[PDB]
Amino acid sequence: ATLFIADLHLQTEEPEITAGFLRFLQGEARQADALYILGDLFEAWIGDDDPNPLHQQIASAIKAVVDAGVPCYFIHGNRDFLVGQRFARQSGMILLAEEERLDLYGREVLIMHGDTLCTDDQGYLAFRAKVHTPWIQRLFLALPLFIRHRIAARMRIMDVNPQAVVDAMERHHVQWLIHGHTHRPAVHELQANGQPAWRVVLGAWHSEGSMVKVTPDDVELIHFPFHH
């Protein structure tokens, strides 16, 4: 099976979610063919030089999975778009583009975080266009750590636009889309490419985790409580 997760929003203040993630990594993930993390792995990210110990605990847990023969992949979310090549290296994770078209046992599937589908929030889209500008990023990342922390400190979810969904599945000519961002776990049926299509939406990790499990014959969205 190939596994997809998203919207863990991992942080120092929620160790319970972190332990549920580490349980997942040490059991479920080890049996998989591949693990894809579709963004918002972290609640925030101000650069790979942050010495936050949570960041290394996570990179090490993912790296163990990678080193067991299970490739892990990462698509950025809106929370963690600054995750960079040094984190990739520490984690063993391969950074992917904002949209990837995969081939899972013969089935073609589009993966993305899902924030780009939220076209009714121009407030957000304006923000995203800015923070995706490389010179703006590199500016931020050139600041001393202590100034970046204070900038984030200061800065303290629209559903998808149905048409944006259809447009994305039609650009890639796919009948399957997996995404997160919206925190509304569900399987949807629509039409794309003159045919039945499915959009599978992952949940955020709070009381429960969620994953999409793709096998040769089946696609399942699975929720699991943190009970052990």
Next chain:
Amino acid sequence: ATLFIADLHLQTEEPEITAGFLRFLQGEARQADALYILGDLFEAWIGDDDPNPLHQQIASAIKAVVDAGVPCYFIHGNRDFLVGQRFARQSGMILLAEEERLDLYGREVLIMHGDTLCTDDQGYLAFRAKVHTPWIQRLFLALPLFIRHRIAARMRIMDVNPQAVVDAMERHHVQWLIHGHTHRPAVHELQANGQPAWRVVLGAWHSEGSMVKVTPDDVELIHFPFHH
């Protein structure tokens, strides 16, 4: 694994949902230890003497499962409370009470349809108390079929009360509850019996089916599209 499903609302007008159910019965269900159907298997029921061919197609598909060594069980919903011992016999299904406390590989779990938890709808609860009165049922069931059909024809969802949930899990001293009715698939965490508790809610069958799969170590809520 032990499987739980609910809220299929099967009917003549939705053959697609019926085929998705029959797929499920012929694959997934055959590998299970037991299958529990927690109510609203049918969109309506006016008695086991209804000759609706859908009713026999379903009973035969369930009976095949039962005859393969997989016991099936049924708790009534609000839609199909008149399902009776003749349908049980045709289907091989065992009729259970409105609340059952099960033992699944050592774990104690409460199952119910879930309409009884909806105590903020007195409109419904009044209705339910009436249609659960045996003399009222037997009256209805004594009518000629054609009159019952016309009575149903004339008759053309509140979420749970959180306290009613806690009260139910505390009456049975359980940390696990599985139910349907509300059509809001989710895993919830609460407190019961001074401890962590989980309520797992099944979805209705529309574009997707849903099931709770209980194994010795895990409880998962699974959604699956009808894609094959």
